[PDB]
Design a protein around this ligand. Structure first.
Ligand code: FMN
Ligand code: FMN
Ligand code: FMN
Ligand code: FMN
Lengths: 340, 340, 340, 340
């Protein structure tokens, strides 16, 4: 049974052995609170690589200390992070899986003690601290921080880099009018609201020419917020800037009610894919190979991102292969076990 | 867990208790070869009604003897067929399931001994008898047969009627230029090739004002045949004539290779749905409630047609309800067994 | 994958195509309240035959009106019941499934309005009417009713007969000292409490030489009641009298707490099987083919009785066959659907 | 839903959080060929600990170099192995799982280049090297090797120790007449054939008073070989010697045909359990919580050992808990994922 799910996919120079991607998920397991890779990560990620996941994307990694979501996040603001990250990379690549990292900045949604920054001094909600309005210098510092991150990620041996522009974090906050009330050239206009992201992408492409992903929130789920069609122009923009694939998520810019169901974000992925003629990754309640195969075969997305499902079963690819009657390469150690 | 799969759907004033539809499937179980409903059908269909299927479409029923696919098909060319059909109707509606029937004519794909008819004297393949080219009288005679069938179906107490215009059968043969080489008013142009279907729809609507489906073959899978885009104008046409929902299938006008996979015909259904602005039914390798829910929630179709799965498990709705964590009314006899 | 679950089993000369048995389950669907077979039964049972169940035991059928559990039960106290039962027999055997019937008498647990009878004038609980203490004439009259029932069952064309001596009903009430306080030849000792059952078996065998099952309640779940060990001598007794297989259930002689779990009654079945050297049927939360195969291969039982599972899925045998990678004959109509 | 599967079990002073045990499975992943713990093991085992397995038993670890099955086996013949083992122990215990190790000696089935030892100079088969007949000194050396192993295992922080007396390896070879043709006090008699094992157990108990398991092969599957009843006396013996639980497997003493099916070795486990009044572990095609729960509830074994299933899904406990409606403690990191 020849399937698309387990067919190779080539981005730039990198060739993934299948279409299965481990969606970036924070583990909050940096007990040392210095952003260092810990034992938990060294067991957590390689498990999925053994599980035959084609691409494993490391959780949101703060490019600055105040850029972290929490004090237990992975970091990459120092050359000291390279060693631990390099070790992690080796542990993953070892099993035939490609490894990526999600460069992130939590913006006004950072729960790190102290000052937090954002496009405008507007709180996420009435329970969150008011962020500092970023100055011009702040913006350029942060852009430089992202570039430094990409540099270290490449240094560590990462195959793919993703820019976290979603889930209501810093970049997302520049994108949405809900959070961006600036009146300089970084706000008050679709083009202006895109500027920050545009700079981040340029800065990264300046030190990184390998696969580049950008994760977006296709919708704010708010009458005065962004919708999928607002991200078509942005996607075409990202394509022009050398972005290889758009990881299409949604929401979290502000507290909002969201109807959730199997593949509730797939239409966002197909929309961007077809309207902007750019590869996309589908994420959101993808739990079966049957479902993943339909997503791929019907051209709704090129890569399938799994979140919670890969937390429940690190070897999901095996079960999916069984479900689809496909055959994959089991680790020699598990040959007799993965066998029918 | 509030789901769309197990939400009611009203069509023309008929309320289906859910979105699950039993796709019309030939049983070839008329041992008497007279098109009469037999014990098999009386056990086969009601079983799915007990299974809590919302709508059960009875297999292809020949409006004329030579219109049957085989001599073991159900027939409706005689008022004598009513009694048996009415009994079947009661057996099904008894459990809260709506019942439909598929009015059919095999055309050049008929395997019943004797003369077979078609738009043009062109055989389906080198293993099929060459059909007689239909005269005007033949065409009007067949249109009348479709009306007689609808009339009898109404008297039997059917809730829904579907016109079989797909799978390369008679009507499909008029629609496709691959099989229709006529140079009169019934061929040579889009509206001419549609004429036969249009007349059938009108003839039926003259005696039937209930929910009316039309099953189409969205693609001929042939370079010189029809594709989805060809059926958008047709679907709009059908909407104007009072067609309530398009049951979107594909293929079988000529021998052709099909790439089959989960939901391989869903895009056809959504295409027609959104471009023709008409309710559609998705069919083709729909096997899980998870999959079915995605199709509905994402507006790809309004009803989900199940074929093979409903032959494997007549109580599929129960399994799907469990899968989705939905709650449905079990038959009072099975309450202690269906108890989650 | 050669399995024991889907291996034939011959009992007295009757060959069952597999080891799957539909456990007798009351449907309370005799709306006419005359014990007549109704449309429900004619759809309910044959569905499992199409499902490829090897043996289908019809629900508890009252040998006398007051012997019914409720007025909506099947009856067999009249020659008028034969016609309907014979029709049901044909509907089932039509698909290669053997059909059995459970001859029953509710005793003090009868809920039909009027006088109810029992070994002693002791109510099931404080919510049940106190039974009339049976006279010798009553006992012989009831034994004759069981024979009449067997005679009619034979004429209807049944393949297997099961005597309901379990679930705290009439016969069970004679067996258990909790309900049998008689001081005549029918109580006061092990063989005396067995006497009624022994007579019923003899009466039945006088008109029936086919496969004969006896359903027992292996345990009363009461400090002063019977336990499995008490039924070993009884099972040996039954073997001597020509009983072919013991269907081993438990409980319900009085209100009692039961610890229920997968195969919670299997040990009872294996106990009887190995100590009395007699074929047994295992029943009670048997839900998977995996589980069923273990029961058979490990010699815990010879037949597997399914209850609730067969109400949830009439085609369970198909699912179980897939689970075990076994091959079974699909109904010719469903061949393309059951295709693995 | 309160289950036995996820109920604590206490051995000596150790308390397992559930009845789920990871059966010892060779990984052949010691690339350095020095028996050292490698990166593979450090990822392999902790994964199951994260998966909420209650007891994880490390693969067969050779107590001597020639005692290894292969050159890629884990070893424990040197104090140098302690460091790596201690690290492994920490990585496992970290997640609430108890960790054990299987002390092993491959005997005549060793595939290590060079001399191999056995009770008698008889080959496993015509494709295997002829083993050296062990002298008295050889036997005492090997017994001392086992004691040294236990010492180091305790030193490393292991919770449980298992002695590998099965699968036709050294100890098993002393047990079975098929392989043991000695005429000294170590052969020619059930008592004599047990002597080697008896000494090994004593030697271990001399430096270890924590939980002690012994894995046996209940049957040789050969007319002239051992059967389950031969191991009853041995089990009672092991109980007398302070053995806490008998891990009941079977076969592999010589090439033999073996009928395999769900729980094909459970009867061996129950036999030893009830006849010798000693806790046992059941292993062999246990793949579902439903099945595991029946094994526990019916007193067939006290602990459930999973092999291949735990290779296919390291987080099996989660799926089993779901299957049984039980609730367990998910790692905080996976809380949102293991959640319904
Ligand atoms: C525990 C957890 C942590 C997450 N952290 C991240 C993250 O760091 N970066 C990100 O892009 N998405 C994050 N998300 C979202 C997931 O990556 C995923 O896209 C989302 O949960 C939906 O995917 P799923 O339905 O397959 O779980 C997280 C989700 C979960 C449950
Ligand atoms: C045995 C069988 C008979 C069928 N007969 C008909 C038919 O009479 N009319 C029709 O429109 N489709 C017929 N089909 C196609 C089914 O309606 C259904 O669309 C097709 O099998 C694919 O759906 P599925 O993947 O859910 O099985 C038949 C299919 C099968 C397997
Ligand atoms: C609705 C229902 C009706 C039943 N009626 C009978 C009956 O008439 N005779 C009988 O022996 N057992 C009867 N039982 C018990 C079943 O035969 C079966 O042994 C029990 O439900 C447990 O089996 P299971 O776990 O496979 O469902 C009935 C059970 C149910 C759920
Ligand atoms: C790859 C593999 C390695 C094994 N190595 C060992 C071992 O080192 N020690 C042992 O006692 N059993 C070993 N066995 C047997 C397993 O521990 C297990 O008891 C057997 O495979 C049956 O269990 P299962 O059906 O759950 O897989 C091994 C089995 C497999 C498949």
């Amino acid at each position: 049974m020849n399937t698309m799910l387990f067919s190779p996919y080539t981005i730039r120079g990198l060739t993934l052995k299948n279409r299965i991607v481990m969606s970036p998920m924070c583990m909050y397991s940096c007990d040392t609170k210095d952003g260092a890779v810990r034992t938990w990560h060294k067991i957590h990620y390689p498990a999925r690589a053994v599980g035959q996941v084609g691409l494993i994307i490391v959780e949101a990694t703060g490019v600055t200390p105040q850029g972290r979501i929490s004090e237990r996040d992975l970091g990459i603001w120092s050359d000291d992070h390279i060693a631990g990250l390099r070790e992690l990379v080796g542990l993953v690549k070892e099993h035939g899986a490609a490894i990526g990292i999600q460069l992130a900045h939590a913006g006004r949604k950072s729960q790190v003690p102290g000052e937090i920054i954002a496009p405008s001094a507007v709180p996420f909600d009435d329970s969150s601290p008011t962020p500092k309005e970023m100055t011009k210098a702040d913006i350029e510092e942060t852009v430089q921080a992202f570039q430094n991150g990409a540099r270290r990620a490449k240094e560590a041996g990462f195959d793919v880099i993703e820019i976290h522009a979603a889930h209501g974090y810093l970049i997302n906050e520049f994108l949405s009018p809900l959070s961006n009330r600036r009146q300089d050239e970084y706000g008050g206009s679709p083009e202006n609201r895109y500027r920050f992201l545009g700079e981040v992408i340029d800065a990264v492409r300046e030190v990184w020419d390998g696969p580049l992903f950008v994760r977006i929130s296709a919708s704010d789920y708010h009458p005065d917020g962004l919708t999928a069609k607002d991200y078509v122009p942005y996607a075409k923009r990202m394509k022009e800037q050398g972005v290889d694939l758009v990881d299409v998520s949604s929401g979290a810019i502000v507290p909002a009610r969201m109807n959730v169901y199997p593949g509730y974000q797939v239409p966002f992925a197909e929309l961007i894919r077809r309207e902007a003629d750019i590869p996309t990754g589908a994420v959101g309640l993808i739990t079966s190979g049957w479902q993943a195969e339909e997503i791929l075969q019907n051209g709704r997305a090129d890569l399938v991102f799994l979140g919670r499902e890969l937390l429940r079963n690190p070897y999901w690819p095996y079960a999916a292969a069984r479900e689809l009657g496909a055959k994959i390469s089991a680790p020699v150690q598990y040959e007799r076990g993965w066998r029918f």
